[PDB]
Amino acid sequence: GNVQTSVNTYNITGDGNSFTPTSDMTSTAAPAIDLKPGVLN
């Protein structure tokens, strides 16, 4: 967790972070991208 500083806009051990799940926003990237023949073109 050693301080970095600019590489990325947020420090991990940074001031006032906060792990806190909300039933409201179910974390998700993009897995189901459609590529099948008919659907991709």
Binding site: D24, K36, P37, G38, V39
Partner: protein, 604 residues
Amino acid sequence: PTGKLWRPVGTSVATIDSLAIVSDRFGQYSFVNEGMRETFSKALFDINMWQPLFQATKTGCGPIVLSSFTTTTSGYVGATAGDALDNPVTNGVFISTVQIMNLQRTIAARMRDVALWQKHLDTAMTMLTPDISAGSASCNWKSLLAFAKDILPLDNLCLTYPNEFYNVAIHRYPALKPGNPDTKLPDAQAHPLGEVAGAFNAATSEVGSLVGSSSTLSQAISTMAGKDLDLIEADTPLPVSVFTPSLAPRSYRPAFIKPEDAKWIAEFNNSSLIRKTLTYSGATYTVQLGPGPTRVIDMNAMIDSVLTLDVSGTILPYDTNPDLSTSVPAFVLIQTSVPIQQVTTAANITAITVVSAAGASAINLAINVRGQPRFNMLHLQATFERETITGIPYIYGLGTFLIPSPTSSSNFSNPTLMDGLLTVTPVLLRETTYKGEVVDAIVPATVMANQTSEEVASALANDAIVLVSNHLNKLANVVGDAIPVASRTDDSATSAIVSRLAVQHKLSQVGQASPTPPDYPLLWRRAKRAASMFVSNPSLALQVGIPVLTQSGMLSALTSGVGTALRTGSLGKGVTDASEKLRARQSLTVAKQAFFDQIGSLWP
């Protein structure tokens, strides 16, 4: 563009650093690309439809326009300052976080509202199959109505709002055509809000149904790429993971499985009996290894599983040899010095551990079922672990009896309780088993036509064979499903094979009088039953002695055919037997028209 919108925090000059997610009091504006508006519009569209029922029941709050949750900001919109710099969008349409919240909880709140009514409308709608699939068929409206006026149970919602539900309905069922006000007659055409979608689902007589035939293909294509049917007979080490073995616990009946028919099970084929002893819970019992060969589960070549030998309904002759009664049946390991199948007498058996005994002798576990006392269904059960048997060259799991006192009566009995239905469940998928060894990778092509009739049915839960069977089985349902391997249509599947048989039978004819020009009508037909026999019983392709199917070419061939075959089906694949299929649909509409005719008379 896509992602959240950014703007030059440093002003004017927007470089790959003078940007910053334009956040604020509303959250962060995320761009609403063209297609993502199709969804939220398609979702809201399906809610607006229920407009007449929202007013009737004073809920709702007016029609939900998607243009109430968005905005018209402008800036650079990407996933990160760097890439957002290449998407300068002006007056794009973004939806702020706090908004992405309402368009969400609104579509959710309204979705409940309608989901309910929409359920009442249905128990009444489908309650008179408003859907036929060949030609038409009416049912004089008066009757129809005066009829449902009955059936519909007193707690629907189609009785409290008839033409408040009817107006919602007219937009979902192009069956109900409302009578035009200024000519007081129907319309021929039916205009339900789902105008196009409903047009493209009708079972078009030319080819089954585009919506069907289309999916049955994309569906198969999914599998073909997914599980990894491709590469099905690849000749080279493959991690068991590549076979996604899951929910895989097969059960048997040893003490029957020949030792050569399945490496994981050796037998004590010795002349006389081998009565040994062991102090178990104080009391001294005698393991028997009776008259017959007593096939025992070998421990090596036994992927740390959960062996659960069930002993039930199986005979328990404590009636004759009284010797048998009193002995608590129990699964016991047996470490032998000299390798089994070379272990002659008691002094040979190193030690014997009762890995799991059954409390209470053999005269409480019984239950008379017509003379022949059976075994009250009970499950003895070890939890074998790869390394608990480290070093130990010879050790065998045996579900025997543990007699408290061997006698002359039990001199031809042989108390192996293995005749029971044992159920091994691999508890550690990563490691498989093949030909008696534990491995981490299979070599597919090796397991083809390498097992015998029963060197397959005797496979051990999650072993190459059982894996190279679970695999073919998927590929077997892709062909069975998508491809027409069940009609005289010499399909892409049975076609990939025919080309192999030719190229094969053709070179076997090269050199020597070549008195036989390849056949073809006979080859097409031979490969048709070959591809067909596969779809039928996927397994066979593992058994030595199966015509065509077991030559190295096929399968590796088949799949890669079936492969490209699915990636071209078109959409109208349903044209196959779309004639009798059609004629059968007209058959149904003629019988359903017959129904409407009674609804039409009984309730005039």
